Amino acid sequence: MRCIGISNRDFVEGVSGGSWVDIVLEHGSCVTTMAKNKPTLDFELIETEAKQPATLRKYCIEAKLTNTTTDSRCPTQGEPSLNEEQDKRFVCKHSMVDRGWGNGCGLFGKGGIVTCAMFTCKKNMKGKVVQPENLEYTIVITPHSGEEHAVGNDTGKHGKEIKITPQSSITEAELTGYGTVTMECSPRTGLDFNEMVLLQMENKAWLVHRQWFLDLPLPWLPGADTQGSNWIQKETLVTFKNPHAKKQDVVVLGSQEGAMHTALTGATEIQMSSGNLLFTGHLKCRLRMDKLQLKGMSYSMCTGKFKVVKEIAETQHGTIVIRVQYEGDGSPCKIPFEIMDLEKRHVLGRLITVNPIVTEKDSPVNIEAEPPFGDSYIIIGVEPGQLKLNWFKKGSSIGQMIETTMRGAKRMAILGDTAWDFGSLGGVFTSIGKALHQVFGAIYGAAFSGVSWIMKILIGVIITWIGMNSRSTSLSVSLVLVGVVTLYLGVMVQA
Amino acid sequence: MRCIGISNRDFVEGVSGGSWVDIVLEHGSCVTTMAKNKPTLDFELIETEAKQPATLRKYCIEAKLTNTTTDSRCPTQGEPSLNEEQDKRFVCKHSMVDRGWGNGCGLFGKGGIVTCAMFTCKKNMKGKVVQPENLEYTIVITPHSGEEHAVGNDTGKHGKEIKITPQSSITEAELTGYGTVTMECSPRTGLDFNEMVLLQMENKAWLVHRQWFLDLPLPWLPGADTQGSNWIQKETLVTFKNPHAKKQDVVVLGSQEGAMHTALTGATEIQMSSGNLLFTGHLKCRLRMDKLQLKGMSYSMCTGKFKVVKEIAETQHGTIVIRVQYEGDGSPCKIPFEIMDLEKRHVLGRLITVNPIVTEKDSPVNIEAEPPFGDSYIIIGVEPGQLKLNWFKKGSSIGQMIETTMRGAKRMAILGDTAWDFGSLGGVFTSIGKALHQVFGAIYGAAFSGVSWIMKILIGVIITWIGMNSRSTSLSVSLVLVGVVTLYLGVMVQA
Amino acid sequence: SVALVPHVGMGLETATETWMSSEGAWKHAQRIETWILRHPGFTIMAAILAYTIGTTHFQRALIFILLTAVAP
Amino acid sequence: SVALVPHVGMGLETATETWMSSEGAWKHAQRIETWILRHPGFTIMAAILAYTIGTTHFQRALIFILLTAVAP
Ligand SMILES: *[C@@H]1O[C@H](CO)[C@@H](O[C@@H]2O[C@H](CO)[C@@H](O)[C@H](O)[C@H]2NC(C)=O)[C@H](O)[C@H]1NC(C)=O
Ligand SMILES: *[C@@H]1O[C@H](CO)[C@@H](O[C@@H]2O[C@H](CO)[C@@H](O)[C@H](O)[C@H]2NC(C)=O)[C@H](O)[C@H]1NC(C)=O
Ligand SMILES: *[C@@H]1O[C@H](CO)[C@@H](O)[C@H](O)[C@H]1NC(C)=O
Ligand SMILES: *[C@@H]1O[C@H](CO)[C@@H](O)[C@H](O)[C@H]1NC(C)=O
Numbered sequence A, B: 001m002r003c004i005g006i007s008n009r010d011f012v013e014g015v016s017g018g019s020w021v022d023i024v025l026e027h028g029s030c031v032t033t034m035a036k037n038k039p040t041l042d043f044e045l046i047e048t049e050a051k052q053p054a055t056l057r058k059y060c061i062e063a064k065l066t067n068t069t070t071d072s073r074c075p076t077q078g079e080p081s082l083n084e085e086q087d088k089r090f091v092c093k094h095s096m097v098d099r100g101w102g103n104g105c106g107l108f109g110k111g112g113i114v115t116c117a118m119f120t121c122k123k124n125m126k127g128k129v130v131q132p133e134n135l136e137y138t139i140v141i142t143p144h145s146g147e148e149h150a151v152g153n154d155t156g157k158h159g160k161e162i163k164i165t166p167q168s169s170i171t172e173a174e175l176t177g178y179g180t181v182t183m184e185c186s187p188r189t190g191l192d193f194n195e196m197v198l199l200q201m202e203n204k205a206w207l208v209h210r211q212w213f214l215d216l217p218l219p220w221l222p223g224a225d226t227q228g229s230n231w232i233q234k235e236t237l238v239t240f241k242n243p244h245a246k247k248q249d250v251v252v253l254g255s256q257e258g259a260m261h262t263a264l265t266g267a268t269e270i271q272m273s274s275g276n277l278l279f280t281g282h283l284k285c286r287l288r289m290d291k292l293q294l295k296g297m298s299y300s301m302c303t304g305k306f307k308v309v310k311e312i313a314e315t316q317h318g319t320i321v322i323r324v325q326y327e328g329d330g331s332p333c334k335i336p337f338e339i340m341d342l343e344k345r346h347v348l349g350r351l352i353t354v355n356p357i358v359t360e361k362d363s364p365v366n367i368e369a370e371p372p373f374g375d376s377y378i379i380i381g382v383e384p385g386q387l388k389l390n391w392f393k394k395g396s397s398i399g400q401m402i403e404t405t406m407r408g409a410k411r412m413a414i415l416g417d418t419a420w421d422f423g424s425l426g427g428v429f430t431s432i433g434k435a436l437h438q439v440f441g442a443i444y445g446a447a448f449s450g451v452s453w454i455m456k457i458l459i460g461v462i463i464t465w466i467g468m469n470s471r472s473t474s475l476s477v478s479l480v481l482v483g484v485v486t487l488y489l490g491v492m493v494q495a
Numbered sequence C, D: 001s002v003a004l005v006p007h008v009g010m011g012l013e014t015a016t017e018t019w020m021s022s023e024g025a026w027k028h029a030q031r032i033e034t035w036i037l038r039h040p041g042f043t044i045m046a047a048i049l050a051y052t053i054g055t056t057h058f059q060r061a062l063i064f065i066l067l068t069a070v071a072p
Helices: A257-263 A397-413 A415-421 A427-442 A453-468 A476-494 B256-265 B397-417 B419-423 B429-442 B453-468 B472-491 C023-038 C039-053 C060-069 D025-039 D040-052 D058-070
Strands: A011-013 A018-024 A030-032 A042-046 A063-072 A092-097 A111-121 A138-143 A161-166 A168-177 A179-185 A196-202 A207-208 A239-241 A249-250 A283-288 A306-309 A320-327 A335-339 A364-370 A377-380 A388-391 B011-013 B020-025 B031-034 B042-046 B063-072 B093-098 B113-123 B139-142 B160-166 B170-175 B179-185 B194-202 B206-210 B239-241 B249-251 B283-288 B306-307 B318-329 B336-342 B364-371 B378-379 B388-390
Touching: A018 A030, A018 A042, A063 A239, A063 A249, A111 A249, A138 A179, A138 B139, A161 A168, A161 A179, A168 D025, A257 B256, A320 A377, A320 B170, A388 B011, A397 A415, A397 A476, A415 A427, A415 B419, A427 B453, A453 A476, A476 B388, B020 B031, B020 B042, B020 B419, B031 B139, B042 B283, B063 B249, B093 B239, B160 B179, B179 D058, B249 C023, B397 B419, B419 B429, B453 B472, B453 C039, B453 D025, C060 D058, D025 D040, D025 D058, D040 D058
Parallel strands: A011 A030, B011 B031
Antiparallel strands: A018 A283, A030 A042, A042 A138, A063 A111, A092 A111, A138 A161, A168 A179, A179 A283, A196 A207, A239 A249, A306 A320, A320 A364, A335 A377, A377 A388, B020 B283, B031 B042, B042 B139, B063 B113, B093 B113, B139 B160, B170 B179, B179 B283, B194 B206, B239 B249, B306 B318, B318 B364, B336 B378, B378 B388
């Protein structure tokens, strides 16, 4: 459950090396895992809270000037000056006006004059950082079997919500009737904060790269504002325009709200209002099997009368989720279920719920199978074979190997490195695979960072060419280098 | 007067072809003209009003959303829709959420859902255009002679302020005691409005190129707002973010004040508050001499006792403006004035005030001469030669021909075409000179417009090279083409 | 300012849409276009300096597309 | 937006200072610098593709300076 119909998705058929499942989950993802035993699970993490952060900086965006005065001194003898410049709480500028003889000055030619204004900020925004210690992720995993709760009941109670903070390590998940799934989250290498800068803003926020955050112009504060206003800058905003010669005064240069927004156009949205719970994250971890047994395996494979309640959908090649409704032969028991091939028995349909089990002689359960490519039959129920539902999919073998090639490739070129953490267990392949993409990734493909996607692909091309019409062997490597990797990141990227 | 010590400046010694003086003036400029007669004049135009314009457009910059609703319909059967979309006064968006089986919908897979919001604007800014008819320039010209009014009295009354609107053509200027200077302004080819777009903004404004003004993004209105709010766009602002899949809602995207400003970074400042009087202009015209006689030429060249009241300044090679103070021999009369060469008479000092004339046996007048390069003597007053003031300048012949070469060149590469209008009268030179720079200017140098100055010079270089290492004669033309013209505009331009 | 050097490819790309779906991404080019369209004068110039500076066909093509995008 | 395609060289240059004295003019480059400084990684890349694409020394120099300013 919690995943049936969620687009982003993925399965993992395999327990390997005794409970060693390797998974990565990112909010709108829910990873589901099957095994040659154990009621497969649907994993989805949600609320990823942060607590007790600190205000590191405080750019303001609605500056306002007041008290503004201006002194002048006359040709040569005196780069003009006055009291006001004393209170750094102001702003000033030494400039040259043509103070001439008639002006009522000295011996005309040209002279000095400064302008000054007390600078009050009106609505800053404030950054914020969070020590990874205090990055409480919430993980909600769950069984199947179905019920009135059904699919994506979301707002209810199933699998519970085992919350985990790296301020601990491995967490037990008491799963009703089944046992205790054990997870080893690595919340310390996921999002990668204290590299990240939480940033509120007039009531809305953005997780944003530390650097950039310590560069965007504007008049800034420190961390310990508390009645300060000694804004390092102000020069970013407020400007004193000096037309042609004389006069020369100051001006606000307006707010910056929307401007700010438009500038911030790469960071993900988030929160701040309600104990800032920054979604979008993506942590990995070892899902540790064992001590995770399926429910039935005891009571008979009961036979009887049963209708159905709904046809069948399928988002994601194979999601045959069928509603049934047993009756007659009572007492909570199993269910005879097969995904056979048109009449002539030779069954071949992947089961995902690993046997249901009725429980209330009412409880319209629902199974979840992955029928073959062509046409398939879901024969559910023995004795007079009470029911056989003919269906047909489109599991077109090859269409499969491809959409996977990509969708997978995607999960790769989004997460990077940890992409390999999706393949439970190493052994040269996935193990060394990471080991290499790890650095070859963090390098080239990831050492020419910060360039807008457009430019990115542009380099893809210029390079595919500097490659393509190459000169002896080396080209192939050059091409690939271009193709995919970059050329692709680009045709993809831009989250 | 009105110019002594104003940096921007320029003289014009010559009446030519009977009163035909050709001048160009731009606010902080004041053009001064001398003749082999006529009390030379200081011309300075100021207040250049505009009246009865119209609001052409009305971009808003503080959008705000309300009432926002959202409908969804389910996989396939229905690109979702609701009443609200009816009132174009709103905003909407048809998007795809993964409405799944459990979601409490249909047969999961993917579906439609639109979002909609009533869009109220909060503080637009409004453009504005002005028919050249109603572009009242104010021209203030004046004599010399000096007085208590002295230099740059500005705020007083001297020469009067002959206002001229192309809603007329030539204007007489009744100048006390002197006569009537006649001007033929060409207010119809100066600034060149209805090409220009007057633009107010939260109380401050900018004259700005029509095109650009009809392109800058934002939600716009028309001209006849008056309770309208059917803002063509809104799509410029307000955005409904759709995280990963579900939800999908709208947001303001903040104000735009300062943003606006920063964007508008090439237009000149102006006004709007106080009957929008847009300075910065620069009109040309024929200053028509004759009927403009000097005052004295009658009463004797009187002799007597006279002290002085101030030394001498000089901004702009030669601005010897000296304060004197006659006495004794009474009755308002002339003044013996010479700019002789150290002892040994051989006089050679340019006079700019063309004889003063005392008038109140108090009135500390002030002359204005242009002493030679080296050292010079200002012998003022006969009989016991009562007074000779030794001074010395720095009119270093060549330093002159150069600063002129440039300063002039500047006035050229700012105004363009009309640069030639500074040379009173044609005759192949100035006449055909314009005739050529006219088109050769409006073309190349002016047909690759709109590029930031930086890029400008960049092309200068790339071209000087594509030139420099050329191949037979053509290069010279190529170089020049580069050098100055562009290379220079750039090293200059950016007003 | 909060107009340029806009936190883009810093590197936190995440499976879930960011702040400007793709509107921003597409928009950018959308505006050079509006511009180039505006003053063919420069398109003209550019491509020319191109034709001459370089020589290696692809060369030309290259510095050309650039100059274009170079001038906002 | 009121962030880009900023009424610059439209063509109304006037003897009297405009809206951003020169702060804006200088600032622009001032920020590419901040940027290039930031990710030498790209300076690196650029100059390289340079060294190879072109050949005519000046060529190289050219597409190089560009790529640099090309990526804001
Ligand atoms: C989500 O889970 C809740 C929890 O059971 C389901 O709500 C029940 O709906 C039935 C139908 O009328 C009520 O009789 C129960 O009282 C409800 N439970 C309570 C107390 O909330 C709901 O149907 C599920 N929906 C989904 C699939 O999300
Ligand atoms: C500007 O012009 C005014 C007009 O005369 C000058 O002001 C006069 O100053 C004297 C000196 O005290 C007063 O006695 C007069 O009454 C003033 N005139 C009036 C009535 O305003 C002023 O000195 C000039 N200053 C300059 C050079 O700008
Ligand atoms: C700021 O200037 C205003 C001038 O109107 C004055 O009233 C106010 O007291 C000043 N603030 C201070 C305390 O400096
Ligand atoms: C807008 O929505 C609010 C909902 O709180 C409602 O009170 C208001 O009347 C609505 N405006 C109209 C008249 O559509």
